[PDB]
Coordinates of C-alpha atoms and ligand atoms in Angstrom, one line a residue:
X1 CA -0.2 -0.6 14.2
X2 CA 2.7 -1.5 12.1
X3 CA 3.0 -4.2 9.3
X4 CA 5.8 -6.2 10.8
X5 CA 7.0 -6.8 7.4
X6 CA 6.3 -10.1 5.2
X7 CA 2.9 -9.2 4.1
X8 CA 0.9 -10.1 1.0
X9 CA 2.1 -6.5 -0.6
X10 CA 4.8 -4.7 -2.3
X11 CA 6.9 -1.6 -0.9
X12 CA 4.9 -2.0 2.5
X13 CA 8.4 -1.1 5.1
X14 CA 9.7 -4.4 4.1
X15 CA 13.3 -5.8 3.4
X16 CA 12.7 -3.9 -0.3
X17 CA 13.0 -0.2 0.6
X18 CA 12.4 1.4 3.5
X19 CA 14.2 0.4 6.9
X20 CA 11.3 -1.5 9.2
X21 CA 7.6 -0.1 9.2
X22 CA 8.2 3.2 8.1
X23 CA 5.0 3.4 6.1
X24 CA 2.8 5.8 8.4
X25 CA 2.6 5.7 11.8
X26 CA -0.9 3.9 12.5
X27 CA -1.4 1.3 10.0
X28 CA 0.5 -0.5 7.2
X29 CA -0.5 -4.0 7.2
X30 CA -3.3 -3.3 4.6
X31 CA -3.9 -5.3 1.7
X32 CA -3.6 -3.1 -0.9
X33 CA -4.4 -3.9 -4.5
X34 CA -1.2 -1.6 -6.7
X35 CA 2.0 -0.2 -5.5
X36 CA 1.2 3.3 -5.8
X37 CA -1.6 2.7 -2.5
X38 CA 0.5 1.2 0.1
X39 CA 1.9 4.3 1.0
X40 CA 0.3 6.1 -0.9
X41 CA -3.3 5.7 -0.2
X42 CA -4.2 6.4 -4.1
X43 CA -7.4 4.5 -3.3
X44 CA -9.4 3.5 -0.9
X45 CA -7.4 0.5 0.8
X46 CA -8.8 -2.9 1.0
X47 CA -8.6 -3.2 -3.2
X48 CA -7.5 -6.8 -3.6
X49 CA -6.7 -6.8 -7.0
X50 CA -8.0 -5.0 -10.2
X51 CA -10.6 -1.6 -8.5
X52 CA -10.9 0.4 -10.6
X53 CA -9.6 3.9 -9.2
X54 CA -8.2 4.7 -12.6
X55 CA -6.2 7.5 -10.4
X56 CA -4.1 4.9 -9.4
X57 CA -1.6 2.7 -10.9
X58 CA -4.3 0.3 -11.8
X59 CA -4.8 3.1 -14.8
X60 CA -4.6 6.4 -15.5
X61 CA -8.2 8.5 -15.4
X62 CA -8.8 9.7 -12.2
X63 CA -11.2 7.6 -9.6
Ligands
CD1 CD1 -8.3 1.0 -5.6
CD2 CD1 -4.5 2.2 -6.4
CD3 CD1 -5.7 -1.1 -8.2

């Protein structure tokens, strides 16, 4: 239920983008491992760093 801004992310409705929890409108303060998941979902959230859904930003060869 919203991310409140100033979490351990990137483009997550933040002063960087958006106006103020935008992403969604359930959840947002997930710790997503690219930029092209947090609202984007491109894999499964909860990735802290380095997957391996090659869908994703993280690489380029599906998941
Ligand atoms: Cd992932
Ligand atoms: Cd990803
Ligand atoms: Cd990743």
């Amino acid at each position: 239920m919203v991310c409140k801004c100033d979490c351990k992310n990137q483009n997550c409705s933040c002063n960087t983008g958006t106006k103020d929890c935008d992403c969604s409108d359930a959840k947002c303060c997930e710790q997503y491992c690219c930029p092209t998941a947090s609202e984007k979902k491109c894999c499964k959230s909860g990735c802290a760093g380095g997957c391996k859904c090659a869908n994703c930003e993280c690489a380029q060869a599906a998941h």
